[PDB]
Amino acid sequence: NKKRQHGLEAKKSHILAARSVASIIKTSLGPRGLDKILISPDGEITITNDGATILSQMELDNEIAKLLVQLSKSQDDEIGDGTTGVVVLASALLDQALELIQKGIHPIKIANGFDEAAKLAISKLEETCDDISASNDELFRDFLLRAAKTSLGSKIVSKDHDRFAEMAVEAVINVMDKDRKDVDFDLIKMQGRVGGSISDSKLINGVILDKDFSHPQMPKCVLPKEGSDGVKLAILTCPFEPPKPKTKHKLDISSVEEYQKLQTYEQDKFKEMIDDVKKAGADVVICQWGFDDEANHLLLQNDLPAVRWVGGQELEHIAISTNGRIVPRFQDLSKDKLGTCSRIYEQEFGTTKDRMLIIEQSKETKTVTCFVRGSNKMIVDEAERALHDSLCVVRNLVKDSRVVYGGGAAEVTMSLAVSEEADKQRGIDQYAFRGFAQALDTIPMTLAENSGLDPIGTLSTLKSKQLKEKISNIGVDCLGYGSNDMKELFVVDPFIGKKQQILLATQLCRMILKIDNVIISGKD
């Protein structure tokens, strides 16, 4: 079960495979983009326009495509923005290469050209960069928001998405420190409840997890009581109560004395264990198993809410901000072995009776977990993806104040620059540098084709104004506004992101054009 094909004709097989990958992802590019139906292994129906999930759930058997996907993962992991453009641009770069192959251009002569042409394009893009953070700090916050809405207004939340941008820009403002000059995106957890509306999503200044207090007589809010070590959370596997197995018992009872004798044992272990909560230093107790009712009533006098059947990772997320520990026994617990917060309160959301638990530090917290609602279970999944992506939108805008005015205008601006350097080639490479422009044009072309605009005249419309007039942003009208000028529409992409799109795509040309054999061995 191996392949046999000799000559450059094998590269025609390889490129024709890439055209299949593109025919999938192509139609997903743009805010007017078309969705894909994803058949889950279990039959679950997922509908998304996100090329990261489209490529992740895309299953193809040609190993050339498996390379294209594995390499595109680096766009999602390092940057997290335009994985879609990596595949779309690469396909066009390979499509123009197919023409170069037939013209007799040696495979390496092709690769050397795309490398030097990228050195021209990225440089000419830098000549047009702009500083989104210029002037005042309040202007930074303003423009930071104006762009964040461009990523959120493209999803189902677009009706009132400004509210998801409210939590996003304010979150990264809380999570970003200009002295640190970096944003640890793991400091933000994405979590919501199934059902609700856009206005039911909240900006939460602290940790919220899918839990509620296990006993209604315990206080829904615990405070340090003016000066204590905040609110400590007990993270244990066993409850504070007389020991009772959760599998089998097998306690032989020989007489009535022995029968009720366990209740005597329970009374001392009831008060001992609930005193061991207070002595151990827990203000609330969360254990993998629940707590005895009589212990629960003895906990009441000390205001010791508790929660049952909770996994370690969920309490870990709290323990990250509170510096808690999973101590094997309650006897070695301390004010520090049990992590500390300032306030734990249980919040009800209108008709939502879930009443989730929120852990705050009564100050600027080291972590936030924002609250997401949406009218359909699957809307919530994508809505949190919008917060994930818009979190990376502002994360890159913090990383690099340099931005480009996008919408295909930067690609056409770079395309025109490549055509300017075409006349300066006057050599064999002139064949290849020109094709780089023909490939750069496929991004604004794809943007127009997914929008319902003229696939050819749109290219001449953008090139006309970006050539005869000025480098002023002349974008694609996919948003349905009046005309071009994304500076007026405040549609902006990160500079470092577009640089990575061009450079990573060039790497894909180095990877695909330099594979001459596909040897697929069997398995024993």
Binding site: E63, L71, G312, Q313, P328, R329, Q500, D516, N517
Partner: protein, 508 residues
């Protein structure tokens, strides 16, 4: 059967040559090989290609044998031994059809390899301290081999990671295992960092670390083959209970037993505790209270080198530890390279090894300069091991081919045809060096023949400018024993292929 078995055997050898044909050279092409483990590799390394080649034809299994041995016997030449050996088979097709017996063919190849290696011996130039040293010679060779790469702008950083990395190795016992290579995602090529020690993952799914001293001026390393944990952050384990009152007592008792092991380690006094198995939360905070380093996920490749670095060893027992199991370096510190946790030892004076930590934009982007450093390490390795230098880049195959033609001018008889083919076959190396590089093979080969015939024995293939030039002056230097053992290896390989007249198959 008969001579037709040779014809079929030759056709099998052609398959191997054509497969490895594009792999030759720094400008060469990669092969995508899907393994039975579903792991797929894309590599230009002939050894990687060989390990996964999956040859089933008994005749071509011979070519794998001589090539796999070329790797361990010499250390380089896994591609050239398959190219040269294959062309010596391709040149044999017309000679077999004309009825030249296999002894007549093989005898001449055995006479030719003797006549050829003699001239490889004549060409060798002795370069150890010859008007050069570490900083000059190794840079002239490393800067050349690392040219025409994604580091074209950043060579000084990879020359630092190349020449000073290998020159700082133990030269009395010099081997590739002395430099480890670890892929660090994130960063830039001009910012990629090298370390004197070895690195570790320390990426546990449990958070709450780093609030623990990770740095010691005089660490004391204790390595265990067992885990140090009780309560796991993710899964759990069955704990057996004897009584409803002892259901929670065994949990307390489980604290006692692991606390006891951690207590005996607490007294042991190791400032660094390494383990091959995961470390739990009880030990996480416990050793934080002890203010010593402890981490699992340590490999033997990292750990056995730690033993050389600090002078410890592995002892799982908590009470039976002999002082010789603990050692100390000049500095230990967990490194945050590239905004990612990679624990390492820093500046161990007893360490005979080091590690290049590779930073870059993407994992594949690193891989491009990764195998480049892999080769660069070998570039210096041979610069020190082999004082006898022959001109690389095809110049040797030019020099030999001329002497072979003169032997065919003087030697008359049935040996004349065989000698000439042995020479014609040596042009497959410069031919594939040109076709894999993108040059005009007919133009370059004809200019190589005319230029060499003018008396210049150092002419060779220049990859920077499509031209023929003095590769000796370009410091494109290759070991003599590599070319000698490769040429002897190929001749024996052709003696194995040409000498088979029957294949006997036991089926069942």
């Amino acid at each position: 059967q008969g001579k037709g078995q040779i014809i079929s055997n030759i056709n099998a050898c052609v398959a191997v040559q054509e497969a490895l044909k594009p792999t030759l050279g720094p400008l060469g092409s990669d092969i995508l090989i899907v393994t039975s483990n579903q792991k797929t590799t894309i590599s230009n390394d002939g050894a990687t290609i060989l390990k996964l080649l999956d040859v089933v034809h008994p005749a071509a299994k011979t070519l794998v044998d001589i090539s796999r041995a070329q790797d361990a016997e010499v250390g380089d030449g896994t591609t050239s031994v398959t190219i040269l050996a294959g062309e010596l088979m391709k040149e044999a097709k017309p000679f077999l059809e004309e009825g030249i017996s296999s002894h007549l063919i093989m005898k001449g190849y055995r006479k030719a390899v003797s006549l050829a290696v003699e001239k490889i011996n004549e060409l060798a130039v002795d370069i150890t301290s010859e008007k050069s040293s570490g900083r000059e010679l190794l840079e002239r060779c490393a800067r050349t081999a690392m040219s025409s790469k994604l580091i074209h702008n950043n060579a000084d950083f990879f020359v630092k990671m190349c020449v000073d990395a290998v020159l700082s190795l133990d030269r009395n016992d010099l081997d590739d295992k002395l430099i480890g290579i670890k892929k660090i995602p994130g960063g830039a090529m001009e910012e990629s960092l090298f370390i004197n020690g070895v690195a570790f993952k320390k990426t546990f799914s449990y958070a709450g670390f780093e609030q623990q001293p990770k740095k010691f001026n005089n660490p004391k390393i204790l390595s265990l083959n067992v885990e140090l944990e009780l309560k796991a952050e993710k899964d759990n384990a069955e704990v057996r209970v004897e009584h409803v009152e002892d259901y929670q007592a065994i949990v307390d008792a489980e604290w006692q037993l692991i606390f006891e092991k951690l207590r005996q380690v607490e007294e042991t006094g190791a400032n660094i505790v390494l383990s091959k198995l995961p470390i739990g939360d009880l030990a996480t905070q416990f050793f934080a209270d002890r203010n010593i380093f402890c981490a699992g996920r340590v490999s033997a490749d990292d750990m056995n080198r730690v033993i050389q670095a600090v002078g410890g060893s592995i002892q799982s027992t908590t009470s039976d530890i002999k002082p010789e199991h603990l050692g100390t370096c000049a500095l230990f510190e967990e490194m945050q390279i590239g905004s990612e946790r990679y624990n390492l030892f820093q500046g161990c004076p007893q360490a005979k090894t080091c590690t290049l930590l590779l930073r870059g934009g993407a994992e594949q982007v690193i891989a491009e300069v990764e195998r480049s450093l892999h080769d660069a390490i070998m570039i210096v390795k041979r610069a020190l091991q082999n004082k006898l230098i022959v001109a690389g880049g095809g110049a040797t195959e030019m020099e030999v081919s001329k002497c072979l033609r003169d032997y065919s001018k003087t030697i008359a008889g049935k040996q004349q045809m065989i000698i000439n083919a042995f020479a014609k076959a040596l042009e497959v190396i410069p031919r594939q060096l040109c076709e894999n590089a993108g040059f005009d093979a007919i133009e370059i080969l004809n200019k190589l023949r005319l230029a060499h015939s003018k008396g210049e024995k150092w002419y060779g293939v220049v990859f920077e400018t499509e031209n023929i030039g003095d590769n000796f002056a370009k410091f494109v230097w290759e070991p003599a024993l590599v070319k000698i053992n490769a040429l002897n290896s190929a001749t024996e390989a052709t003696n194995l292929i040409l000498s088979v007249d029957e294949t006997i198959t036991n089926k069942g």
